[PDB]
Structure formats: structure tokens, C-alpha cells
Amino acid sequence: MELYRDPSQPIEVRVRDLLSRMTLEEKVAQLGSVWGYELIDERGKFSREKAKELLKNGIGQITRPGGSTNLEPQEAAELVNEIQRFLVEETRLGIPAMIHEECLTGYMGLGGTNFPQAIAMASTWDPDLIEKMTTAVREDMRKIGAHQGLAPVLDVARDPRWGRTEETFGESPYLVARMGVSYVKGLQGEDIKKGVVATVKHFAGYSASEGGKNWAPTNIPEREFKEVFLFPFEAAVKEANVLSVMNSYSEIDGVPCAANRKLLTDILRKDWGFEGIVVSDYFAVKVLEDYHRIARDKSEAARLALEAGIDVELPKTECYQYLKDLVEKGIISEALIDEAVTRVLRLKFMLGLFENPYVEVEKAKIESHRDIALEIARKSIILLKNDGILPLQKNKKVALIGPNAGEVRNLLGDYMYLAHIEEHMKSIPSVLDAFKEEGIEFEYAKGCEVTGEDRSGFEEAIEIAKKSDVAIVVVGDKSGLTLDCTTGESRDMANLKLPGVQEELVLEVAKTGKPVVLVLITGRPYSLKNVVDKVNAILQVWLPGEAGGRAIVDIIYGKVNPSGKLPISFPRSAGQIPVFHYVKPSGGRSHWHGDYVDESTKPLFPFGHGLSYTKFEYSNLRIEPKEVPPAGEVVIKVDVENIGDRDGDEVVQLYIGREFASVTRPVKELKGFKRVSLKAKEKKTVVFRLHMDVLAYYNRDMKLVVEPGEFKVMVGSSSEDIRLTGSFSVVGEKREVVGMRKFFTEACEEAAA
Amino acid sequence: MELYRDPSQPIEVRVRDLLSRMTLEEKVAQLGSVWGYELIDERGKFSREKAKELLKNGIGQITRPGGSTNLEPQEAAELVNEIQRFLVEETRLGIPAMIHEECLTGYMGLGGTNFPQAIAMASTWDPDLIEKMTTAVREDMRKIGAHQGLAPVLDVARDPRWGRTEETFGESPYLVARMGVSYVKGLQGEDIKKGVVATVKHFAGYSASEGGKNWAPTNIPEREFKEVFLFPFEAAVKEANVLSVMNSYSEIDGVPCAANRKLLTDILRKDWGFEGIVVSDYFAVKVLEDYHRIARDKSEAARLALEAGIDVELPKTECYQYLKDLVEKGIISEALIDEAVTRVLRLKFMLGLFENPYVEVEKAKIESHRDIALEIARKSIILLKNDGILPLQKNKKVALIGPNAGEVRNLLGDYMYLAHIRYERLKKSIEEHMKSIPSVLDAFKEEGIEFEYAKGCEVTGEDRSGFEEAIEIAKKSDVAIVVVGDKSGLTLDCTTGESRDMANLKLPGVQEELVLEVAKTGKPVVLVLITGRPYSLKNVVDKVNAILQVWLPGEAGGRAIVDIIYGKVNPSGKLPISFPRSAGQIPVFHYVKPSGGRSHWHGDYVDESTKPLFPFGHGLSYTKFEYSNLRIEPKEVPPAGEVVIKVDVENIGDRDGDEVVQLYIGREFASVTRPVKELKGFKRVSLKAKEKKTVVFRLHMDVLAYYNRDMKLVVEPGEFKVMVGSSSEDIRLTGSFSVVGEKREVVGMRKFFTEACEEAA
Ligand SMILES: O[C@@H]1[C@@H](O)[C@H](O)OC[C@H]1O
Ligand SMILES: O[C@@H]1[C@@H](O)[C@H](O)OC[C@H]1O
């Protein structure tokens, strides 16, 4: 029995033993990948014939054995068992494969629940609920033999033109970091042998491209890069022990992230102590040549990516095969191959793959998590505006108008299987279905398509509105990767107008003088400047997946009290970009008239905005001690009372302001929050335990510091709807924050007195 | 006498002698300033009473003795002579004042020519002509006793939302640097005792504020900062020997430029060898407290600005008076005061102020340079579009429509005196002096055109009252000339200028609707934009027959527009900045990386092209130019070698005209990503009909240097692409040459510019 096969030996001993036994060819194969679809026949069964060519020397990863085959869970599990049996039994060393799938909004394959999009997850401000979700996704993935999910997007979004806004947790480094750590914790176990490797992406800056254009340069200076952009990845590595990172397609200031050793090694591995694998974004190595034009051939692209710190080329071996030739010709040292292979082998051993690489096909049927999807959908929907029309009485005749009332497909995000892809059909409930099921009397008129300028349908929509009590206009996006989609990866929107003639559809329906409820089923903020004052209520419904219809109707009729809060600012117009809550004293205004000539510098809806069908009263602000030394702790308490007549969740938000630091600081920035459930007339105390570590920022010399001085405390229902204000002082000498530090405020509830 | 008063002693000896004689109070006064208006009575005469308080211990600078007093040139000269006599005769040490004025578009005071705005200057692509202009401004300034002009703005503009776009030379670091060096050379001349100190501003990044908003953070990473924003300042310091720099109001990534020693000292003085004075932007020191909130009081703001490298607080001593208290209390070293005073005194001696601080009031009448202003206006106007309607025949009946056809005030930029300065006596005096400037209406009458004028709308507001009159005059005419765009200045009623940022880039008020209404008559339409920024023309471009871009042209504007419309002048201006299709497209610039200027993998936005409506270098002619016979010699050059690029250009059309020949350089397979194409050379060439000439670009490899992964300035072996054309998109001839040898680190002084000339074909 070779040491690497012996389960009593420590993993480092098994890794060293296996590495010492491997040829150069076997080493380079562990840094590569193959598509699931390249290993099946036309009957969807494992093809030994194809495996003999592609798997002869073993392999790092199988890419999307479920997601790329259109196989049902048990068929996918059978394919993976067969791939593994070939590797374990018909290769010299019998190294098993790691399998990855997409899983952002749930396992991206047939039979997997479509959870609401990441921007919806963020809008819950409920990290525990996102952890519950990814704990369910973990079980789904392990059933089909999948070890790695291309997991939370930790890109901080302040440019809603960008088609991937829907995949982010929004504009706030704090909220993004807090959701990212809960997401990673749910996916990964305490013990990864019983869990799924999370992949934080896209490291780093990919959400701040020139003009919001996909893959365009992300030109971010160092303090902003560290405090925004890197912060959530830092928290995922150090607090959540994330085991994979995927690079950004974009250059930072001349350097493609896939060729940046200062980023993928010096920051990620050396500064932060990351011990997992870096996987390329798909084709990110090859396009160092094709797109960025800094690699003269595939072998130079391979050298740049390996030197940078990419361990696995995805989604298929292309450049990394030439690492063999680079060593044989003495261009690179085999020792650098060994370093990457060591990280891959370590993770394979930790995942339990050498003890048992197989799953029980009989237990591989994936269960529905519609219950969890529905709780996210119900908590994620945001009431942007309500003049009193909502909630509606069930006896009102409804004119249900718009492309996103009827569609079902337009409820789905860019990484939901049925959008991303006769096969496990769209038996997903529509909004129209949810209205029927709720017993509402309505007529449906489509009014218009998502795209185009055809106004044919306007007259039917107008006529249905005139014969109704209330018009419910359901407009917004089709999310995906193709030209006909208005949002999603590769679908960037310069001017932030609702797609096609949807805005004109709303204004035409409004001209009937009937009450209008505007339901935005969208992947990004749109400019509502021209419709906001012409409609009575506005619901923001971030691409909600399969639970969307029921949640929208539940909220419209007050069976659910809306509790979602914006995780990203809604610009008045594209020309206002960017707008975010944590501007410096000189940000978020034009000096000395405050506004643009043509436009407010304030967003239409601010960060943390979301209304309720009840009222919350904040009282009794306590900040103790009042003076703390630079590594001390302050305890901030507020009482919150539901003074209205409906049960509701309030999201209590802590903003911290700093002036007279050695650098300029945000006038206010989110540093804590708590979703608190309050029955009508119930009062509770929300408590924020704020360690000074959490308030650390980079000084003029790029040191992480806490400086003596006064911090402003602002607690409220949004970044603008601040209810209580106070301060505390840090007293003592400037502190350099070195090594491990706290990233998060600790937020809980107490009985009020 | 004392060594400092002895003109046979070297300046360094005179400086050391004077410094050793000065009290702490006299030293700190040399780092301060006083407004001209603080030293006059109500009649605009020098007030000894006021001077005894403000000038008792001497002073660094007098701020705008002409620009802030509303005095005529000879009255301003008399005030400055009196200020100087007080300082020379009634202070202990008799140190004279340095005087500064604004002078971007000419001396900013009564009696000064209003030259076209800087964005117009850039549109000429004629650096020699801008040098001729600032040589004239130099004589104007020296007549009234003014020693320093706050002029060449070297901010690189790629965000047309920004109200100060009009003050820049546009988007191209190369074109900005090339115009900046000519601007500075004209103002300074070879010996500064006979010249005027140029002040490059605003150091550094002030044109790239968050959302195009005035003073908002300018968050620029290091390679882009060095190659785009710093480059023109670097060329101005090292090639043009500029003697003053003014800081930016903005923070870079948490650090206000006024408090940034790494910027104002480590880059400017240590890395580049700048020997002149850094002057604050107005109140830039005080607002370290009031705006940025990083100084707890005026004394801490003073310490941050002095440590950073600001020598003179403008426009009035406010924080810098507390430097005295900071030394007396042992918070800062007097040695740091001494270093700043040394720079101020050195410049005063070099200006000749200790030998003769006075001017002849009798010779202080400033001459008109309308001739130079007219050459700039005629060379700056850009023909964006022409289906053949231009030039017009003089016998066509013209409907002259729009707020900028009739309003002479809207010809003026934000630093032209009559626009900038706005008791009841000041209002009357502006309205009085305003009547002197020819209007566009005046130019049409003078040319003998048959026209009716309708002011279809105001610049701002939503009043469509005037539309009907405008439409009716259009229907009775052969051609509608619609003249629309900006009112430039600093107040709420202005649409462009400092503090007037435009988020959505729509023509102001209902001007766009006025254009579309006139177009609906089915009459031919010539659209004339009199503007300080690119506007979105997306909704009008395809509805009009011709478009002229007329960057705020000053007093020569009317005549130049009429000359061009009737073909007395062949238009030859080229865009120095990209015209976005929409605000949501921002930024668009010609020198994007392979991954810039597109969304991957469909190329375009869902709703919009990623390409500008009009690209960098765009400008049509009433003739056609044919490019042939591209030569690049040698084909292989070592990393400090030279390539000679030659093209023949023939005027194949029917009219004499100027072509601006543009050299773009591309680089792939560097160790960093490089622009697909970037302007590295240009030449304005005059061609008679059927005349052919050879344009020659002498390109030293120094000019192509870029920053590598380790932040070294390098030339790397490989291929450089040569693209010569009539715009950044209208490329006529391409080829390439190779750099062969070992990677070169470009150390110390290097060439910044291609050498461009003409020879016989
Ligand atoms: O997010 C990644 C995306 O950028 C790429 O196209 O495909 C792989 C994904 O994991
Ligand atoms: O351009 C400068 C401007 O920024 C400031 O407002 O006043 C002084 C000028 O020189």
C-alpha cells in the first residue's frame, strides 16, 4: 500500500508521496479540465472511447457534468460515477476528478430549484437565510457527485449599466462581505469532505469596467481597491476559509487579472493566507493572447497564468497542456508545476475523493427547495413607493398588463438552468397563475414585448385598464447571454431606460387616470425618473426564480408585509453614475451648486430603502462606553417598536461616519444591520457590538489604521431615513491594525425594558 | 549696498542674502497674497490706508489687480505701480510683489482680446498659432505690470459632463501636452524677465471626477495617472520649463491634492526637477478643513499644504498667516518656511522685480489681437457633417433661428472677463462693454445675406412660445440655420463652465425640440453648435443636412461662422475630444486598450453602439485629401533609435484647404496591455487644389515609452503599428516597424514629441 492510498497518513504525507510518483504528463493533467459533454455518447451515457483519449493521464476537473449534458440528477450521478471509475481503475495512479457546476441561484442543471438572483438574496439583508439556502444547495450538489460550485460573486456593483449587476450583492463592501461569508459557510461544511468548495469570483474589480462594459478595463486606485473590491474576498478567505477563487476577465491598469502574480499570489496567498485552488474564469488563460494581446501564443499564456497563481485551466485544457513542453524545453521550472499540483491534490484528499469518489445513484434524486426560494422571494421584494394603494383589496378588478406578467421565462436569471441553456419543462408558476390561484378577477393584456418598438398591443392594454379598478403593469428584463436578452452576462445597458417601449406602455396606462401598481421584474436598477410621479406604487422584484409569482401576489394583497431593502442605489439617470451611499465629503455632489445643471446628484432611491405596510418607531439610542481605545469595543443599542397594525420585519441599519482622519472618509458607510421580526405593537432592542477593528481604513502610507477622534453613529430604516444619531471617541495613539482582525459588527436582539 | 540689492551678484547669492535678513513675519508674508480690490478706494485708486494694514510686512502676490477691480489697462498699471512703490519704499526690506491674472483665453480684465476657448485652440491642431497667441498675451500682461498668468489647463478630459471641458485641450495626452508646451513657450519666452510665468493646472486628475462632478474624487490608478494625467505636466516641466503649477481641488483615492507631498513634491520637484512655485487653487488650503474634513483648523490646513509643497496661498492669506504661530510653537521647522520663501524670492529676482518693478502707464494701452483670435476661430470650427448643403450660396433666403444666433454673451467662455465677472455700477459696466463685441446676426448683415431672425427659444427653460414664429420663417426661406448650445459661466443660469456639470448631455432647455421642429418643415437645415462641451446629437444628426461645431469662440466668433458657412474659409478643425452618442456611453476615447471601447462578446450595449457618434480627430473639409506612398525607414530600430514616417497628401478637390494629418501608433504583445491606437504625431498642412506635399514624422522610440508591470518606463522589443489618417477612424495608410534588442529602461531626460514637418513630394 503506497502512502498516498493510506487513509491513516496525514494529507501532507499523502500529497508528497503522490507528487513524487507522478510523471510531468500526469502533473500537468491535474491542472486541466474536460467538459462533461465530451465524455458522453448520444444516449447521454459515459463513453469509454472518449475517456481513453481525454482521461488517459488523469484530469484535474470535469466541467459541468450536469450543467453541460442536460442530464437529470440520477443520470448525471451515473455519468460522474463512470468517469470516476475510469480514473480510479484505468489510469496508472487512479487520481479521481473534482467536479464543478454553476450553483449561484442553485445547482444549474435539470431537477434543481431556481432560487432568486444574488441581488434578491442581498435585498433580504438576511445572511442566516442565505446560509440555509447554500446548505440545501450543498446536499443537492453532493447527491450528483459535484464537489465545487462557482459560487458567490463578491464583485461590488456601483454601475447598474453592467449586465451582471443581478449576480452581485450590490454596492456595499460590508453587505457584500456579510452575505458572501454566509453563502460560503452554507456551501462548505465545517468539514469539506461533507461539503462543497465555494468559488468567490471574480477576483478582483470585474464590476467596475470602463462604461459598465463586460471585460473592459477596471482602473481602480489602491485604497479604493483594498477597502471596496478586495474587502469581501478578504473576509471570505479569513472568516469563511473559502477553498476556491476565480479570477477577473478584466485588466487593472494594464495588467490582466489572469496574468497578475501581485494579485492572485502576493495578495491572495502571501498577504491573506489562502490555501485553496485558483481556477481560471472560462478561457481566461487563452484570451491573455486572443483578447488582451500580451501572450504571443498558448504556451506564453500558460506561463503567465501559472506564474500568476492559476492552478486549474477551465473549462477545458487548452494552454496548460503546453506546461509540459515549457518544462521539457527549460523555459519554466517543474517546481512551479509541483506547487500548483500540490494545491489541487491537497483539496482532492480533503474532499474524501481517495477514500470514496462515488455516490449512490439511487439516493441522487434532488429535492425541491421551493420553501426556501419562497422565503427569499418574500423577503427580497422591495416596496420602493406606495401612496396608500397597497396592499390591494381582493375585490378590485385587475388589468394585468405587460410582458413580464405572462412570460415565466422572464422570472429567470442568467445562471438559472432554463434561462442559461423537450427537457424538464417550464412547469414553473407564472405571475398570471399566482393571480388565478389567489382568486383575483383580472384580464391580461401583454401590452408590448420586452424589446422592439411595436406598440400594436397598447390599445388592448389601455381598453382593459379603463374597464378595471387598478392596472398592475409588470415590466422589465429578459435575463441571459444572447442578443434578445436585456440584462445578464454580456448584456450591458448604457442609458438605463426600461427595455423597448415598456416605459411608454406604463405612461399610456397611467393616462387612463386609473390607479397603477408598477412591478419591476428586472436584473438591474432602471431610471424611473419619468414614471415615478405617474404611478401609485412601485415593487422592485429582482429576478425571483420559481417562487416569484406567489411572492409578488402575497405582497400586493398584504398576505406578506414587504421587508426588502435596496442593496444598491437607483440612479435618476445613467448620466448620474455612479451614485452610492458611502461617498466622501466631496462625492455625491457637484461643487458649489450641489446639483448638475440638468439633474439631482442624489439617487432616486437610496441604499437601504424599502417601505413596509406598517410603521417602525426607533427610540432610546445607547452607545457605551463613549470613549474606547483603538482596539476597544462599543455597544450600540436601539429600541424598535411596530406602532402600526400589521406584523412586519424591519431591517435596522448602522451607518458610521468619520471626519478629521489623516485621509478623507465616507460621510456615512454601512457597518452593521439586523433583520428584526416585530408583531403589531411589539418592541425589541437591537444591539450592535462594534469592535474598532471593523472601522479600520488605509492611511496615506497604505497602513491599515484606527486613529483617535470622533465616530458618528447613525441608525435608521435606510441610508437617508436615519432615525437616531450620536457619537463615541477613540482615545489613544494611532494604531496599526496588523494580522487577523474582526471584519463584522455582531448584531442581535434583546428584550426591551 | 546689501548683496540682495546688487544686480552683479548671482541670483542664488541675492536670495541667500535677502532670506538671512528677513524676520519670520516677513518670510510668511512672501507665502501669502492680497486681492487687488482690497487695495483700492471706490474710485479704483490705490489706498495707502488699506496698504498700511495688508502690505506692512510685504506680500508674495497681488491677486488680479486688473481682473478683480474692473479697471481699464492704464488704471490697472497705475494701481500696480502704486502697490509696488509702497512695497519698495515703505516696507523694511522693499521686496516687490508678483502680480497674477487669469489669461487662459487672454488677459481676463477690461481691454483684453477674448480669444477662442482652449477646446477651440486644441481643435486648430496648430501649436505654433497658440504660441503666437500667448506671445501676444505676454505683451498685454507685461504692459499692466502682471508677471504670472494662471492659464494652460493641462487636465485631460474624457468626461464631457464636466463643466470645465471647454478649458481643456481635450482627451489626448499627446495633443494636450503638445498644445500645453506651445502655450507655455509663448507666455514665458526664453528669459522670464521679459516674459510671463505660465501656471499649468490643475495638478493632477481634476478632469476625471466621480460622475463628472466639480471637485469630486478623481480615483485614478498609477499607470493611467502617469501616462494620461501627469504626461502633459511632465512635458510642460521638462520641455517648456514652466515656472508655476497650481494644484487640483480633488482628492485622489483619499488624499486631497493640496495635502499630497507625494504629488506636489516627490513627483513634481524630486522626480521631474521643477524649480518654480506651486500656487494653491483659490481657497484650496482653507477647504482642506471646510470641504475635505482632514484639517481640524486653519493652522493644520497650513501645515498640510506647506508640507505638501504649496509655496503661495491664493487668492488671499488665510491659513498661511498661522505658519508664524506653527514655528513659534515648535510644530514645524523654520527651515521648511525657508525652502518655500527661497522659491518665491528666486522667481521675483528672475522676473527683474528688484531692478525695476514699474511699468510706463503711458505705454499700458493693450492692443487688440482680433487678427489672431480670427485665425484661431477660422481654424477651430469643425465640420462634423455635410451632405453637400455647405458651403451656402449668398443668394439663398436664410431663416436664422436659435438663442445663440442673437445672444453675443453666449459666444463667451467661463474665463473671458465679461462672462466670468457676473454695486449697480458693475452691472451697467458689464452691459456697456458687452455692446462692443460683434454678434453672429451682425456678421450675417455685414456679409449682405437676406435673412429673418427668430429666437425660437431660450438656452434654459421649457417655454416653446417662440417655436411657431421660427417654424413660419423657415417655411418662407430656402435654408434654416439653427444656432443652439450653451451659456458659459459660474452661475446657476449657465449650462457649462466651472461648477456647471451636465449629467445627461442633452442640448440645454428645449433647443433639441426647436431643431427637430424646424427639420419637420422639410427645409434644408444647417445646425451650428456654439457650446463648451460635446452634446448627444443622437436624435438630431440624421435629421439635419450639415453640422458645424463652434467651441465658444469669443469676439471673432460671428465673422468666422459666416466665413465658413459661405466658403470664404474652408473648415479645417478636427475634434480634440470624442462626441458620445449618449451620457451612458461615457467614457469614449480613441486610445482604449483591446478590451476598452467594446462590451464582450456582442461588442455593443443592448441599447447603444460602444463607438462615439464622432471620433477623436474628426473634421470634414469642402475639399477631399488623398493619402499615398507610406514610407517607414528603417523597418528595424533598436530601443533608443528613430523611425522616419513619410506620407504624400494631395488636395484632389476644387478648393484650397488645410488637412490635419494624424499619426496613430499601436502596440500589441507588450508585457502590459497597450492602446490599439494612440495619437503620437500630427501636422496641419496647407494644400492648394491639386497640390501634393510629403508630411514627415521623425519618431524617436523615447516618444513610445510606457510603464511596465514594475512601474518602469520602458521600450520593449516587438512590433509598432503605424496608422496615418484624417481622423482616429479615417485611417488612410497602415504599416509597422520592429524594435529589436534588449528591453530598455528609459532613464532621465527623453524625447516627448514626434518632429513633424513638410517637404516637396
Ligand atoms: O462567472 C463565470 C463567467 O464569467 C464565465 O463566462 O463562465 C464561467 C462562470 O463561472
Ligand atoms: O482655475 C482656477 C479655479 O479652479 C478656481 O476657482 O479659481 C482660480 C482659477 O485659477
3-state secondary structure A428-470: CCCHHHHHHHCCCCEEEECCCCCCCCCCCCHHHHHHHHHCCCE
Number of the ligand closest to the Cα of A201: 1
Is B605 at the interface with chain A, CB within 8 A?
yes
The three three-digit cell numbers of residue A558, written as one number: 398584504
Burial of B293 (0-12, 13-18, 19+ CB in 10 A): buried
Subunit contact B492:A593, Cβ cutoff 8 A: yes
- Write out chain A residues lying below 8 Å of B706, CB-based: 254
For residue A475, give the CATH number of its domain.
3.40.50.1700
CA of A495 to the centre of ligand 1 (A): 25
B731-759 burial code (b ≥16 CB/10 A, e <16): bbbeeebebeeeebebeeebbbbbebebe
How would DSSP label each residue in A388-411?
A: S-PSPPTTS-EEEESHHHH-SGGG
Edge to edge, what strands does the sheet with B382-386 contain? B382-386, B546-551, B525-531, B479-485, B398-401, B451-454
How would DSSP label each residue in B386-454?
A: ESS-PSPPTTS-EEEESHHHH-SGGG--TTSHHHHT--HHHHHHHHHHHTTSPPHHHHHHHTT--EEEE
When scoring B210, B531, B585, B667 by the number of chain A Cβ atoms within 10 A, the one with the most, hence best to mutate, is B210
Number of domains in chain B: 3
- Write out chain B residues lying below 8 Å of A698, CB-based: 254
**Collapsed DSSP state (helix, strand, coil) of residue B493:** coil
Helices A298-308 & A334-350, crossing angle to 10 degrees? 60
When scoring A228, A591, A595, A658 by the number of chain B Cβ atoms within 10 A, the one with the most, hence best to mutate, is A591
C-alpha span between A665 and A584 (Å, rounded): 6
C-alpha span between A62 and A39 (Å, rounded): 9
How big is the A-B interface in CB pairs under 8 Å?
A: 242
Subunit contact B605:A213, Cβ cutoff 8 A: yes
DSSP B140: H
What are the C-alpha distances in Å from B663 to residues A628, B617, B732?
A: 62, 10, 11
Kindly state if the Cβ of B707 falls inside 6 Å of ligand 2.
Answer: no
For ligand 2, mutation pick of B103, B108, B245, B281 (most atoms within 8 Å of CB): B281
What are the C-alpha distances in Å from B131 to residues B150, B201, B377?
A: 16, 18, 15
Q: How many helices (H) and strands (E) does chain B have?
A: 22, 27
Amino acid at A215: W
- A297's CB contacts (< 8 A; 6+ apart) are A289
Burial of A750 (0-12, 13-18, 19+ CB in 10 A): exposed
Of A256, A490, A577, the CB nearest to B600: A490
Closest residue by Cα to residue B168 from B538, B578, B590: B578
Which experimental method was this entry solved with? Answer: X-ray
Atom of ligand 2 nearest to the CA of B102: 10
Breaks in chain B (C to N over 2.5 Å), named by the residue before each, are 422
Is B449 at the interface with chain A, CB within 8 A?
no
Q: Is A643 a member of any domain?
A: yes
Chain B residue whose CA is closest to A226 = B253
What are the C-alpha distances in Å from A356 to residues A56, A625, B578?
A: 21, 54, 61
C-alpha span between A311 and A317 (Å, rounded): 12
How would DSSP label each residue in B152-215?
A: -B-PPP--TTSTTGGGS--S-HHHHHHHHHHHHHHHH-SSGGGS-EEEEEEETTTTS-GGG-TT
Structural element, H or E, at residue B598: none
How would DSSP label each residue in A84-127?
A: HHHHHHHSSS-PPPEEEE--TTS-SSTT---PPPHHHHHHTT-H
- B107's CB contacts (< 8 A; 6+ apart) are B66, B101, B113, B137, B140, B141, B144, B146, B149, B366
Q: Is A598 a member of any domain?
A: no
- Residue A471, strand partner residues: A399, A516
Of A292, A494, A599, the CB nearest to B582: A494
Subunit contact B673:A483, Cβ cutoff 8 A: no
Q: Are A238 and A231 in contact (CB under 8 A)?
A: no
How would DSSP label each residue in A186-251?
A: HHS-SSGGGS-EEEEEEETTTTS-GGG-TT------HHHHIIIIIHHHHHHHHTS---EEEE-SSE
Q: Is A336 left (phi over 0), alpha (psi -120 to 50) or beta?
A: alpha
**Collapsed DSSP state (helix, strand, coil) of residue A289:** helix
Q: How many helices (H) and strands (E) does chain A have?
A: 21, 27
Question: Is it true that the peptide bond before B391 is cis, omega within 30 degrees of 0?
Answer: yes
Atom of ligand 1 nearest to the CA of A314: 8
- A392's CB contacts (< 8 A; 6+ apart) are A398, A470, A517, A556, A557, A558
Q: Is A681 a member of any domain?
A: yes
CA dihedral A504, A507, A509, A514 (to 10 degrees): 170
The rounded radius of gyration (Å) of the Cα atoms in chain B is 26
CA dihedral A25, A31, A35, A40 (to 10 degrees): 40
Q: What is the CA A632 to chain-centroid distance, rounded?
A: 32
Which of B315, B332, B363 is the endpoint of a domain?
B363
Question: Is it true that the peptide bond before B675 is cis, omega within 30 degrees of 0?
Answer: no
Edge to edge, what strands does the sheet with A704-706 contain? A697-698, A704-706, A735-736
Subunit contact B223:A254, Cβ cutoff 8 A: yes
Residues B346 and B397 in one domain: no
**Collapsed DSSP state (helix, strand, coil) of residue B118:** helix
Is A707 at the interface with chain B, CB within 8 A?
no
Residue tagged 431643431 (cell numbers): B515
User: What is the β-pairing status of strands B718-725 and B657-667?
Assistant: antiparallel
C-alpha span between B721 and B664 (Å, rounded): 8
Q: Is B611 a member of any domain?
A: no
For residue B671, give the CATH number of its domain.
2.60.40.10
For ligand 2, mutation pick of B33, B61, B68, B102 (most atoms within 8 Å of CB): B102
Q: Which of residues 339-378 of B touch A (CB under 8 A)?
A: none
Closest residue by Cα to residue A115 from A374, A476, A433, A364: A374
Residues A239 and A127 in one domain: yes
For residue B246, give the CATH number of its domain.
3.20.20.300
Residues A314 and A405 in one domain: no
C-alpha span between A696 and A705 (Å, rounded): 5
Is B595 at the interface with chain A, CB within 8 A?
yes
- Where are the strands (E) in B583-691, listed by range? 625-633, 636-637, 642-651, 657-667, 678-687
The three three-digit cell numbers of residue B610, written as one number: 460602444
Which of B314, B332, B363 is the endpoint of a domain?
B363
Question: Is it true that the peptide bond before A420 is cis, omega within 30 degrees of 0?
Answer: no
CA of B417 to the centre of ligand 2 (A): 14
User: What is the β-pairing status of strands B255-256 and B251-252?
Assistant: antiparallel
Subunit contact A210:B586, Cβ cutoff 8 A: no
- What count of residues does chain B have? 761
Burial of B330 (0-12, 13-18, 19+ CB in 10 A): exposed
Residues B339 and B377 in one domain: no
- Write out chain B residues lying below 8 Å of A485, CB-based: 606
Residues B572 and B679 in one domain: no
- What count of residues does chain A have? 753
Residues A72 and A203 in one domain: yes
Helices B370-380 & B557-565, crossing angle to 10 degrees? 40
Burial of B418 (0-12, 13-18, 19+ CB in 10 A): buried
**SS3 of chain A: helix, strand, coil, percent, to 5:** 30, 20, 45
CB-side exposure of A471: number of CA atoms within 13 Å?
Answer: 31
- Report the alpha-carbon angle A550-A551-A557, nearest 5: 90
The three three-digit cell numbers of residue A81, written as one number: 460515477
Closest residue by Cα to residue B548 from B495, B618, B616: B618
Residue tagged 412586519 (cell numbers): A648
Q: Which domain holds residue A271?
A: 3-363
Chain B residue whose CA is closest to A587 = B216
**Collapsed DSSP state (helix, strand, coil) of residue B649:** strand
Subunit contact A596:B213, Cβ cutoff 8 A: yes
Q: Are B212 and B587 in contact (CB under 8 A)?
A: no
Closest residue by Cα to residue B756 from B85, B132, B182, B76: B182
Kindly state if the Cβ of B281 falls inside 6 Å of ligand 2.
Answer: yes
When scoring A162, A253, A698 by the number of chain B Cβ atoms within 10 A, the one with the most, hence best to mutate, is A253
CA dihedral A434, A439, A444, A450 (to 10 degrees): -20
Residue tagged 473671458 (cell numbers): B416
The three three-digit cell numbers of residue B97, written as one number: 510683489
C-alpha span between A172 and A178 (Å, rounded): 10
Amino acid at B459: V
DSSP A693: G
Residues B682 and B576 in one domain: no
Q: Whose CA is nearest to atom 5 of ligand 2?
A: B282
Number of the ligand closest to the Cα of A64: 1
Handedness of CA A441, A445, A449, A455 (dihedral sign): negative
Q: Are B283 and B318 in contact (CB under 8 A)?
A: yes
Residues B108 and B234 in one domain: yes
Residues A356 and A373 in one domain: no
- Residue B756, strand partner residues: B697
Which of B562, B585, B608 is the endpoint of a domain?
B585
CA of B247 to the centre of ligand 2 (A): 10
Is B668 at the interface with chain A, CB within 8 A?
yes
Residues A514 and A458 in one domain: yes
Burial of A425 (0-12, 13-18, 19+ CB in 10 A): exposed
Number of the ligand closest to the Cα of A103: 1
Q: Are A391 and A109 in contact (CB under 8 A)?
A: no
Q: Whose CA is nearest to atom 6 of ligand 1?
A: A282
What are the C-alpha distances in Å from A445 to residues A259, A397, A430, A512?
A: 52, 14, 14, 15
Is A250 at the interface with chain B, CB within 8 A?
yes
Subunit contact B222:A253, Cβ cutoff 8 A: yes
C-alpha span between B187 and B244 (Å, rounded): 12
Residues B636 and B538 in one domain: no
Q: Is A125 a member of any domain?
A: yes
Residues A421 and A516 in one domain: yes
C-alpha span between A675 and B408 (Å, rounded): 61
Q: How far is A256 from chain B (nearest CA, A)?
A: 8
Q: Is A144 a member of any domain?
A: yes
Closest residue by Cα to residue A634 from A504, A727, A531: A727
Q: Are A236 and A180 in contact (CB under 8 A)?
A: yes
Q: Are A397 and A441 in contact (CB under 8 A)?
A: yes
**Collapsed DSSP state (helix, strand, coil) of residue A185:** helix
How would DSSP label each residue in B306-357?
A: HHHT--B--SS-SSGGGHHHHHHTTSS-HHHHHHHHHHHHHHHHHTTTTT--
Q: What are phi and psi of B542, to 5 degrees?
A: -85, -5
Edge to edge, what strands does the sheet with B692-700 contain? B625-633, B642-651, B692-700, B755-760
Closest residue by Cα to residue A198 from A219, A186, A184: A184
The rounded radius of gyration (Å) of the Cα atoms in chain A is 26
Structural element, H or E, at residue B61: strand B61-63
